[PDB]
Amino acid sequence: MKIDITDYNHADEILNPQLWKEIEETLLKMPLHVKASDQASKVGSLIFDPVGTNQYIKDELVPKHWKNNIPIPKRFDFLGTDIDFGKRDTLVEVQFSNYPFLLNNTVRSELFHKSNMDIDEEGMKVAIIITKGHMFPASNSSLYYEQAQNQLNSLAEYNVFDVPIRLVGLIEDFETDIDIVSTTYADKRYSRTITKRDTVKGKVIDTNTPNTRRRKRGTIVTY
Amino acid sequence: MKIDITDYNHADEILNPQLWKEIEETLLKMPLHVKASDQASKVGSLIFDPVGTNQYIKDELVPKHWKNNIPIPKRFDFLGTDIDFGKRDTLVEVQFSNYPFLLNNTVRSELFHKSNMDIDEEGMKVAIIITKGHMFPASNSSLYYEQAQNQLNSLAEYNVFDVPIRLVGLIEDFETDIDIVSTTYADKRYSRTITKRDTVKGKVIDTNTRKRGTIVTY
DNA sequence: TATTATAGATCTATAA
DNA sequence: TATTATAGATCTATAA
Ligand SMILES: [Mg+2]
Ligand SMILES: [Mg+2]
């Protein structure tokens, strides 16, 4: 997929280039993953698939020596049980669940940084938060990149957090032939059990009009 | 219901006593609302009902001039569309959704404070966040008071936020008969349409010698 | 086995 | 009616 990046607290000057390269290469290689919605009135419509996307990233990063689901130390257990990935001094959270998780993940990362807890036998120095762009139709209230950008931009203006964060947004060109992974799961909601997965051709239709102030999400189609 | 309070950034001295009285008297007179779980291993077991609780609070506060769902001004629209209630300079969030909402609600309150946005014709000065105690069985990942206290306590230890916040936890004594409102909605999940509602007596059974209790009605 | 605590998925409710 | 937006509700997945 394509990516857009926004850096906070100089994450760009802090993030190890090799560690970033491993993350970047994985996200650039990755095709857009879609699945059928079960939302009323749009049953069967294609939406961004967070299950497939998360599994792809896990399958790519673990072999690159990023540890998955690193436990959070008992002294911070009220902040959670684990972090998605980590390698050396870098933590990564892939966040496609509902929007408040952006601030939950941001604030807990701040506290981890303030106390310098270890990520991978090294104190934490920077966090990467992966999100999907607004352009893709998706479950209601799932976090999207522009939303995260706007919120973190405001927190930065007001000096709310000092931890370096590289915010990544997964995007694609509109109205362009691209390869898409389309997955069918064993149940219409929540299942992570694959029934069928195929790589197909598709594109993202731009449904904006001169009056929609670019808020319309695209329509995904596959052939 | 009974209540427990934890204050941050001196909300105890900053919060207007009269405004607090209006919120407190509502929470104190309110019966515990419960409904059936639709979770796979426990279909039918009684759990805290956020729908009934939220509606009860709205029905009490709106007549007392607390505006509901006040729109958030366009300049802060990336923080959301509305706030649950506000009166004068005080914002109230009733939060029974999933736990990350606690930090989302806290951070946006901090920004509303830093930027002085108007709540009800006055700039925001204090937030009240209402939550339910861990003691009640409830949907998975729904926020509970002790978790909120632990997180805000840690943020306060590290001097992360400055906005005054009064955190309220709704609780009951265990093993004591109390008033309960038990409701059946039109659909087993999400519905806010009441099909049947009964006011009954019941209690929260404790198996502790911290585990959650079991709610029963009579 | 059976229960929890997240974490993640993803729905409906509601207004603009 | 169709879409946007959260906000709220509340499920399953997974491991401890
Ligand atoms: Mg994640
Ligand atoms: Mg609320």
SS3 sequence, chain A? CEEEEEEECCHHHHCCHHHHHHHHHHHHHCCEEEEECCCCCCCCCEEECHHHHHHHHHHHHHHHCCEEEEECCHHHHHHCCEEEEEECCEEEEECCCECHHHHHHHHHHHHHHHCCCECCCCECCEEEEEEECCCCCCCCCECCHHHHHHHHHHHHHCCCCCCCEEEEEEECCCCCCEEEEEEEECCCCCCCCEEEEEEEEEEEECCCCCCCCCCCCCEEEEC
Q: Distance, in angstroms, between B179 CA and closest chain A CA?
A: 32
| Cβ contact B8:B167 at 8 Å | yes
C-alpha separations of A130 from A39, A91, B38, B99, B142 in Å: 24, 11, 32, 20, 24
B22 CA, D14 C1': Å apart: 43
Question: Is the torsion defined by CA of A109, A112, A114, A120 positive or negative?
Answer: negative
Contact B150 A111 (CB under 8 A): no
Q: Tell me how far apart the alpha carbons of residues B68 and B55 are, in angstroms, rounded to a whole number.
A: 11
Q: Is A80 exposed, middle or buried (0-12, 13-18, 19+ CB in 10 A)?
A: middle
Spatial separation of the C-alpha atoms in residues B213 and B174, rounded to whole Å: 8
Rounded Cα distance between B6 and B20, Å, is 13
Q: How far is the CA of A154 from the centre of ligand 2 (A)?
A: 22
**Tokens, residue A13:** 């000057």
Report the DSSP beta bridge partners of residue B68.
B85
Residues of B in contact with A147 (CB under 8 A): 78
Question: Å from A13 (CA) to C11 (C1')?
Answer: 41
Bridge partner list, A166: A7, A128
Measured CA to CA, the distance from residue A6 to residue A106 in angstroms comes to 14
> How was this structure obtained?
X-ray
Q: Which long-range contacts (CB under 8 A, 24 or more apart) does A19-25 make?
A: A19/A87, A19/A88, A19/A90, A20/A128, A20/A166, A22/A61, A22/A64, A22/A66, A22/A87, A23/A61, A23/A92, A23/A128, A23/A168
Do residues B85 and B68 lie in contact, with contact meaning Cβ atoms separated by under 8 Å?
yes
In whole angstroms, what is the distance from residue B80 CA to residue B109 CA? 11
Question: Which CA distances in Å does A188 have to A37, A116, A120, A204, B47?
Answer: 8, 42, 37, 23, 25
Give the strands of the sheet with A46-48, arranged side by side. A46-48, A32-36, A178-185, A194-205, A219-222
- A102 in contact with chain B, both atoms CB, cutoff 8 A: yes
Classify strands A82-87 and A67-71 as parallel, antiparallel or unpaired.
antiparallel
Residue B24 CA to residue B7 CA, distance in Å, equals 14
* Nucleic acid strand C: bases within 7 A of protein CB: 3-16
Angle at B214 between CA B213 and CA B216, to 5 degrees: 140
Is nucleic acid strand D under 7 Å from B142's C-beta?
A: yes
Judge whether A111 is closer than 8 Å to chain B, CB to CB.
yes
The amino acid sitting at A115 is S
CB A19 within 8 A of CB A11: no
- On whether the CB atoms of residues B94 and B60 are closer than 8 A, the answer is no
> What are residue B24's phi and psi, to 5 degrees?
-60, -45
- Tokens 């009579």 correspond to B218
Kindly identify the ligand whose nearest atom is closest to the C-alpha of B85.
2
C-alpha A58/C-alpha A193 separation (Å) is: 16
CA pair distance A29, A179, nearest whole angstrom: 11
Structure tokens at A221: 């189609």
Q: What angle do CA B151, B154, B157 make, to 5 degrees?
A: 155
Determine the topology of domain A2-223 in CATH: Restriction Endonuclease (3.40.91)
| A100-114 and B145-157 helices, crossing angle to 10° | 40
Alpha carbon dihedral A171, A175, A177, A181, in 10-degree steps, equals: 50
B108-132 burial code (b ≥16 CB/10 A, e <16): bbbbbbbbebebbeeebbbbbbbbb
Separation of alpha carbons A31 and A134, rounded Å: 17
Å from B88 (CA) to C4 (C1')? 41
Which residue in B172, B64, B70, B75 sits closest to B122, CA to CA?
B70
Distance CA A191, CA A76 (A): 30
- β-pairing, B2-8 vs B165-171, is antiparallel
Residue A32's DSSP bridge partners are A180
Is residue B173 within 8 A of residue B144, CB to CB? The reply is no
**Taking CB atoms and an 8 Å cutoff, what residues of chain A touch B116?**
none
SS3 B33: strand
Closest to B53 (Cα-Cα) out of B139, B151, B119: B139
Q: Which nucleotides of D are covered by protein (CB under 7 A)?
A: 2-16
Q: Which ligand is nearest to the CA of A55?
A: 1
Alpha carbon of A190: minimum distance to chain B alpha carbons (Å):
13
10 Å CB burial of residue A120 (0-12, 13-18, 19+) is middle
Under 8 Å CB-to-CB from A10, ≥6 apart: which residues? A164
Ligand found nearest the CA of A97: 1
Is domain B2-218 classified as CATH 3.40.91.20? yes
Nearest to A138 by CA among A199, A212, A52, A209: A52
**Alpha carbon distance, N-terminus to C-terminus of chain A:** 19
CB contact burial A137-158 (16+ within 10 A = b; e otherwise): bbbeebbbbebbbebbebbeee
Pairing assessment for the beta strands A126-132 and B126-132 based on DSSP bridges: unpaired
Cα(B96) to centroid of ligand 2, in Å? 7
Crossing angle for the helix pair A50-61 and A17-29, to the nearest 10 degrees? 140
